[PDB]
Amino acid sequence: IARGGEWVVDLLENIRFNTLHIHYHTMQQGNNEIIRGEFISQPGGAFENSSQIIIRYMTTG
Amino acid sequence: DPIFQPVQHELNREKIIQFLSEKVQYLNERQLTILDKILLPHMGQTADTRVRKLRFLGLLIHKILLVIMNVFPPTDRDSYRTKRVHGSGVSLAKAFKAIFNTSVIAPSDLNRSMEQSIISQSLERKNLLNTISALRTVNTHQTERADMMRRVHASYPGYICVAQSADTGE
Amino acid sequence: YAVASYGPTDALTGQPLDGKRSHGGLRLGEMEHWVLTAQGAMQTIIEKSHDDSDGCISYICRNCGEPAIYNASHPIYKCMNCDVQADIGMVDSRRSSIVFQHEMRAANVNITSVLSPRVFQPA
Amino acid sequence: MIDQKIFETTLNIDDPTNFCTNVEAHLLKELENIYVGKCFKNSFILNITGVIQRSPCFIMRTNNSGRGYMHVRFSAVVSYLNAFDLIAAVKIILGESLLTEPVTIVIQIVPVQLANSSVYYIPGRQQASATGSI
Amino acid sequence: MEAGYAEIAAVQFNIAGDNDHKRQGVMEVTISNLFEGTLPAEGGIYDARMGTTDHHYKCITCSHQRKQCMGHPGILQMHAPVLQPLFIAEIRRWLRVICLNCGAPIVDLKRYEHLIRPKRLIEAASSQTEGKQCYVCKAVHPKIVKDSEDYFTFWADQQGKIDKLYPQIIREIFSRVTYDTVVKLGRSKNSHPEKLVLKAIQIPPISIRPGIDINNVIQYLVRKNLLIPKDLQIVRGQKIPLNIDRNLQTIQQLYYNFLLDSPAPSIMRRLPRKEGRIRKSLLGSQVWSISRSTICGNSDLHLDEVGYPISFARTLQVAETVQHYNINRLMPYFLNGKRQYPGCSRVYKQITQSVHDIEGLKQDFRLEVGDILYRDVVTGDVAFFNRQPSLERSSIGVHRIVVLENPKISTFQMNVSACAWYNADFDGDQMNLWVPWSVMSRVEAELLCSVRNWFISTKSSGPVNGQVQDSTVGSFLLTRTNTPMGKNVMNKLHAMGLFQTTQTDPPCFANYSPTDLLDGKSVVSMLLRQTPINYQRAPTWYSEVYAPYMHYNKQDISTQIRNGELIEGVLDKKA
Amino acid sequence: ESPSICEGFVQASSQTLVIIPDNERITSNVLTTFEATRLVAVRAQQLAINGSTMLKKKYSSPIDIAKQELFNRKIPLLVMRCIKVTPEGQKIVEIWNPREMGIPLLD
Amino acid sequence: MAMQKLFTYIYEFIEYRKMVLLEEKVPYDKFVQMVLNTGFFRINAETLNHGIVSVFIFGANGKYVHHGGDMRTLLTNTLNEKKHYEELILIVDKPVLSKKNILDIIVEQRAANPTIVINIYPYHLFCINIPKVSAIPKHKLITQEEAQEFLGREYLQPQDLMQISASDPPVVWLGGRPGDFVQIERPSETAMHAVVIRFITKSKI
Amino acid sequence: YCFSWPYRVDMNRFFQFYNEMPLVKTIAHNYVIPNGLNTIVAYMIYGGYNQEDSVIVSQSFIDRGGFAGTFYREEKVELSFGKPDPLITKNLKPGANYEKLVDGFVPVGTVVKKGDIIIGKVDRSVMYGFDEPAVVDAVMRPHGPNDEIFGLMRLRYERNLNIGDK
Amino acid sequence: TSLEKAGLNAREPSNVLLRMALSSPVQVLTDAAVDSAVNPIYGIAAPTLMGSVPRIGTMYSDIIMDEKYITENYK
Amino acid sequence: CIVDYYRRVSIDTRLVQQLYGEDGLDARQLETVRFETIMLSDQELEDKFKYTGIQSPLFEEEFSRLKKDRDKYRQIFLNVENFNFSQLLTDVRQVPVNVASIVKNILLSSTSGVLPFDEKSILQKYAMVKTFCKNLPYVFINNIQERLQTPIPVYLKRAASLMRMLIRIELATVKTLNITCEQMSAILDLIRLQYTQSLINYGEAVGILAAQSVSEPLTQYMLDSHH
Ligand SMILES: [Mg+2]
Ligand SMILES: [Zn+2]
Ligand SMILES: [Zn+2]
Ligand SMILES: [Zn+2]
């Protein structure tokens, strides 16, 4: 209840943490690279700060 | 590497750390001390977890290379094995965490701004069904991606209703 | 919803407001204009987009192509560019178009309206 | 001095059915009503006598009013002035000339010689504006 | 004096310089003060000479009141020149193509002469032009670089030595350029590069900035312009003090953000996108005298009729000018007023040029010839019926109004066969309806946009309308040879009863006894005889997939019509 | 300093209306639905401002008067079809008399 | 391949152009050998106006299509011969058309001789009887008198017409110069054939 | 929609008087209150009035309370409350009733129309505006978050099933 | 030529208002100013952006009053 | 793209089409009819359309005109068939006027039945269909230029080719034996009236019509993407 109205905090669909998400950017945009394995690291619980690391293979190799 | 030309061949670790610091012995440690906290914190944030951090990073690179070798497909972006649903408790705490430092630590505004975040869904009381479905709704926030995320994924059955969705509009 | 020929207008464009909530409006968008154009109406479009919308009368000098200052009631007949040679002509327009031309001029793009020539049958 | 100058204009015809019953008479009536005694195109236009060319009574296209306009090239006698020109009688109201050329000059009856500033024929006004000396 | 009718035949686009702003402006912004209590400050950015945003005062310039006043531009004489935000790339192109010391072109004007004029300067500036020696003054052309952290500053690099090209320096450089270099580089005389640096900017008319967020940027610009010294001169290599280096930067940034930002949306961001001035305000329009409601079916309405609820019929009005030929017809409307239907609620008296509400007419019963009466919508009026999205040519059609005098009905009612024009159904669809009130628009609606003109599809050249659902299956049941009860016959009473609601002149049954039996094909032929046509085709009923099973009646599987006499076959989707 | 664009702008050469002779006209002798609709609309608006008609029959609506005037070939209007605007200032038009033209179906 | 088709259809092009050969036809083996040796094969034909049209067929690997100096030498030498020289046609590989230096020498010598028409075309322009291709409607050049009367009746300037390139294959086979008018009899699925007139504009490349 | 509907002040909330358990119920109705009615429906062609997803409804079924209910709208304005005096005159809303006002508010149980004035404020009054007439049954004066009074007038709409209702 | 922005530049380069109405009005307007473009008022989008009405079907043909007929019938 | 006074389609003044549909017809005014002569062999064409009642060179000329029209149709639409993937030649065409129906209606309304042999009428009936087909392209201009018999532009001659071909098939002497000269003059006036009523109006925004007409099938094409 706020400002005289009724509000709900929706369930947000979120990417699982501490997992590698390998992505193929296959439609050739960003042609200088097609792969990226994203990893977001959660230290000890959903409240801690998460650090995202991105590992790429480039066309250069 | 056009950006890391000088240290591409360097074995002097201190030189690497120094060049990283300028791109971003006490200063040598600090830039290395900040690194392990921001690089795979879930493995640990102390100097005794560097070996396992490196092993895990090698494993991640190995998995990406396995995918590039067509040994494995790319991770399914719509499968629910790799998804999580967050509501109320998680969503407010992260917003409270961001709001706590800027309103308390940085210097009645935190209450107002938290409420403003709450407003920025409205509980529609069409019926009891509308209420308990609005609280049972999971929200995701012209390409193949747009097609694929709207489909009935094969991981849905039993967790996401295979029928319930909007019938009109985006 | 049903609205009569009057109500709240937008301050900038002079058009009606947005629908029932604002107590005025309802929209004939791009596609409606395409349909009326394909039907070749052009007098329904005059009525709906000028008489029932932000229709207005503009004054162009015909000697410089620039908007002029004309007033029938308070006698005013002048243009800032070629004052003594003003040849002001009465051009039907819309306030949205006048605002658009003013916005173009505010970006230092000069807009001169050539105006169709006067045609005379041979003496 | 009095001279003749050819002007062009577009009239507006609020009753195109009645106007076309006698185009020349109504046309001269409207031209005299609008332009006689008013500065227009750097001249005063004392009176209108003569229509050289005219257009058909076109019906206005961009509005649903049903009105017409007509373009007119008419020949009119105009009063024009030059620098260092003499005016016989200027009445004090700032001075207003009593002759057939209505000029209000900024300096009983005093004769006036015009200055070199040239006469301002502000279009639409019932007189000219000028400066001079005695 | 009279402003004659004119039409815009062409629009000429150009770059506006200082002379344009000085000539067009009706005032100069000299003060940063906003209001003089209640009236706008004279010399402020709200000065009434620019126009009026309120009903409390007129324009001074044109003496109109907020509606006939289109607004008038003002001038802001800047103490230091500014670069026009739109033409920054043009300034950059002209900088590297012109010698800075004397204004002569450093490039060879013959080399690009053959190119098309819009490309001549682009390609001339494409060349490196660094280190080139001027022929006239033997000066080495510096390197013209762009500061990466803003959009409007130019640096001249002389082999490692760099000096910032201030707008006064650039103005002098471009003033040294002759018109011959301008025309030989493909630009018009009106595109001389000296126009690209403004010392007097145009203050927009208040018409485009009404309400008391864009005026904040104008206000900040005006006061910040006062900070700069009026006699500030900047020669090349002056090394001006830093206190005004920031101040000069913030004026140029304010002017740039005033026009090309993206807070306080700029002038040029009002144009693009779907919500911009062009697509929302110009190419579309919000209109008056229009209604919207849910549509629903009414089988008793003709295909070119629309059911208009009476509440909307009194809201929307038709303007009728009173003359001798319509005065008697318009009197019942005038006497009914708002109390009775068909009534009227407005009167415009042309002698007073004023509109009078029908309730306030003390003795105005003299509805005199020449005044305009706004009367309610009556049955038989034409109305535009539109469903969105308007994709087809028939998405807007004109229907004859049938006013539904039942006060409980609030839907737009239409025949189900008219839905094909709008691709509409009755599951919650809404359509817009507006009744033309002008004579010109009504003549047009009746003669041109009537839905009889969209019966044949423009897209496919075939018919759009026909029987749907119940009438498709009801035509088959009517015209089939046999029923489960035996032959598909009806007696004279039921044959007559089929024509009760056709709203056409009923046929003659006087040759039939009460016990005489009539086939469904016989009663259909009684109707088709009014428009005799010849048709011979197999029905949708007969199909080869069904044929191996089911007993197909021979009389049913070949639909033949000769001069409107249906003699065999059924009527279904095919027919 | 560049001059104002208004200074170097010349408005337009006034045109002369060249009317193609009646035997040289190549446009249709039948009114289009657009031209017939426009003629009826103009006539009906002018009957809203004026009231003088040549119709013997009396009608209570300007639209009906205009429609019958078009059908009965006494509409006091002409159709001018501008076919060319010549660079040396000639407006070449065909003027068609709707009373002599073929009326489209319109119904 | 391209060479035999070009050899058989360049003479069909010359005949379709209503041109008579000044020289005599050589066997195909002699033609390909001359292309391989000299780098080009030159065919000279005479028009009805006794003008000379020279056709040059450049091999893919010849010296001329690679170095602009030899192209300059050849063009300057042939253009100085004592011939009327109505036109010069140079047939090369399509990739040569994207070589900037060859285009530069072509346009330079075109400017050097304003009277002579110099044109450079790919092989596929003459590897088929273009007028006999089913998908190509019948093109024909119309005189300036027919075009003038058509434009006068239609109150049109030549610039109002639909445009066609002088390098269009049917226009090349017709020999249509820019500024000329070509009438096309196009098949129609609504009118069962139709006629348009297209204004010939400047050649591409 | 909410079992505490009369205590609550709601906007665009419809309370339907009569609800029925479905004759053919499902497991869902063990957890959500059934809303709707077990209407008798004939799947038939009747005059072509139910074509293209239209329905013919019994007028008596509407009159008897079928799908009837109350629709509620909230009017909240914030600051003095009171009927304007004739001294104001010029600033008064054009053609507004300004009557039917007691102690600055419309009394509970009064049928208000488009021209009526609800919650007089000082001109700063509030025009009803809606085309559909309403009945006022609520007049509160609660204090806002800064302990400041406001209007909070609740309007009641009696809604039977209409032609054009889905 | 295409139906995209580039096709409209090839077919109607001088119709700035039409090209502004399609997309990117600021880019088109800047090019028109530097090019000193003259936009003849024709078609549909250009007269609409100028607040006028397109000169198509009912506005395609000009109506002129029949003076000869009026003086002989209406005088 | 707007239809001008020549029924060309132009942008401002620059032509897009010499005639709007290449035939200058509104899309709402077309009927699909069959051309009988298309599939007939040479022998069965004679059996059906070669008149034998009168031994005159005119009826030899009438049949050659029929044979040439059939060959022209075949030559055009076999070529159209060639430069397409699967666009088969069809004997059915969309025409402004269904001549076969007009003849049938006139025959029905005729009080007389089988007319007796009248050589003067049959020769004169043939003459005024030959004259009518010759003057057919004047529907695209006006009756003033028809009266003066001024030249028809070539593109306007081609615009009437399909209707001239149908009139010859449907008003062939074998098909109008029972039709009087007064009836045939009424037939021809009815054909010309429906041809005039089928033409595209000046000032029609046919570019918007095409964009609207082609965009709707695009949506169905995208629906059938899964197919
Ligand atoms: Mg629907
Ligand atoms: Zn001027
Ligand atoms: Zn003003
Ligand atoms: Zn120099």
Contact C31, C72 (CB under 8 A): no
Is the Cβ pair I61, J202 closer than 8 Å? yes
Please name the helix (run of DSSP H) or strand (run of DSSP E) that holds residue G117, with its range, or none.
strand G117-121
Helix%, strand%, coil% for chain G, nearest 5:
40, 25, 35
Nearest CA to H54 among E305, E424, E291, E383?
E424
Contact D3, D78 (CB under 8 A): yes
Q: What is the dihedral of CA F73, F79, F81, F85, to 10 degrees?
A: 150
Q: Are F43 and E58 in contact (CB under 8 A)?
A: no
CB D116 within 8 A of CB D109: no
What is the distance in angstroms between the Cα of E243 and the nearest Cα belonging to chain I?
34
Q: Which of D5, D23, D4 is nearest to D13 (CA)?
A: D23
CB contact B161 to A (< 8 Å): no
CB atoms within 10 A of CB B2: 5
Task: Give the residues across from C76 on adjacent strands.
Answer: C71
Cα Rg, chain J, nearest whole Å: 20
Amino acid E21 reads: H
Running DSSP on this structure, what letter comes out for residue B146? Answer: H
Q: Which chains touch E (3 or more CB pairs under 8 A)?
A: C, D, F, H, I, J
Residue of D nearest to E436 (CA): D64
CB pairs under 8 A between G and J: 71
Of J5, J142, J201, the CB nearest to F29: J142
- Give the residue on B whose Cα is nearest the Cα of A46: B90
- Phi, psi dihedrals of residue B89, rounded to the nearest 5°: -60, -50
CB E492 within 8 A of CB E452: no
Alpha-carbon distance H144 to H142, whole Å? 7
CB nearest to I42's CB, from J12, J201, J204: J12
Ligand nearest to the CA of E295: 1
Nearest to C5 by CA among D73, E355, I75: E355
Residue linked to tokens 């049209």: G53
Q: What three-state secondary structure class fits E242?
A: helix
Among C53, F48, F101, J13, CA closest to I63: F101
CA distance linking residue C46 with residue F38, whole number of Å: 13
Closest residue in chain E to residue J26, using alpha carbons only: E458
Q: Which residues contact E375 (CB under 8 A, 6 or more apart)?
A: E317, E318, E320, E330, E333, E334, E342, E343, E344
> By three-state DSSP, how is residue E159 classified?
coil
Q: Please list every residue in chain I whose beta carbon sits closer than 8 Å to the beta carbon of residue D23.
A: 67
Helices (H), E327-368: 327-336
Q: Tokens for J23? A: 């035939």
**Residue C84 forms contact with J (CB below 8 Å):** no
Q: What span, in angstroms and rounded, lies between the C-alpha atoms of C44 and E383?
A: 11
Closest ligand by atom to E102 CA: 4
Q: How was this structure determined?
A: cryo-EM
CA B78 distance to own-chain centroid = 16
Q: Which residues are registered as beta bridge partners of E293?
A: E431
Peptide bond into B73 cis (omega under 30): no
Q: Which two tokens stand for residue B124?
A: 């529609």
Q: CB–CB of C57/C88 below 8 Å?
A: no
Cβ neighbours for F107, distance < 8 A, ≥ 6 positions apart = none
**Residues I52, D63: Cα–Cα separation, whole Å:** 9
Distance from Cα E131 to the centre of ligand 4, integer Å: 12
Question: How many angstroms is it from E15 CA to the middle of ligand 1?
Answer: 51
The DSSP-derived string for E408-476 is TB-SEEE-GGGHHHHT--SSS-EEEEE---SHHHHHHHHHTSBGGGGSB-TTTSSB-----THHHHHHH
Q: Beta-carbon neighbour count of residue H94 at 10 Å?
A: 5
Using the structure block, give the residue that is written with the tokens 């209840």: A1
Residue type at position D25? A
DSSP string, C52-67: TTTEEEEEE-SSSSSB
Asked whether D45 and D37 are in contact (CB, 8 A), the reply is yes
Which secondary structure element, helix H or strand E, spans residue E170, and what is its range? Answer: helix E167-175
Distinct helix (H) and strand (E) counts, chain D:
2, 8
State the best of I16, I55, I58, I62 to mutate against chain C, taking most chain C CBs within 10 Å: I58
Determine the Cα–Cα distance for residues H47 and E501; give it in Å rounded to an integer: 11
Q: H-type helices in chain H, by residue range?
A: 59-63
Tell me if chain D has a CB within 8 Å of the CB of C77: yes
Pull the structure tokens for residue G179. Answer: 């500024």
Contact G191/J23, CB-based, under 8 Å? yes
Helix (H, G, I), strand (E, B) or coil at G190: coil
Give H103's DSSP letter: T
Q: Which of E459, I56, C40, E538 is nearest to J30 (CA)?
A: E459
Q: How far apart are CA B108 and CA B115, in angstroms?
A: 11
Q: And the tokens for B57?
A: 């990073």
User: F1, C105, F4, F7: which is closest to E171 by C-alpha?
Assistant: F1
CB contact (8 A) between residue D56 and residue C121: yes
Q: What does D28-70 look like in DSSP terms, one character per residue?
A: HHHHHHHHTTS--SSS---EEEEEEEE---BBPSSSTT--B--
If you ran DSSP here, which 8-state letter would residue D119 be given?
-
**Is residue E93 within 8 Å of E132, Cβ to Cβ?**
no
J72 touches E at CB < 8 Å: no
Nearest to E286 among C11, C15, C65 (CB): C15
Cα distance between residue E121 and residue E124, in whole Å? 5
Resolution in A: 2.6
Interface mutation target, options J144, J150, J155, J193, chain F, most CBs of F under 10 Å: J144
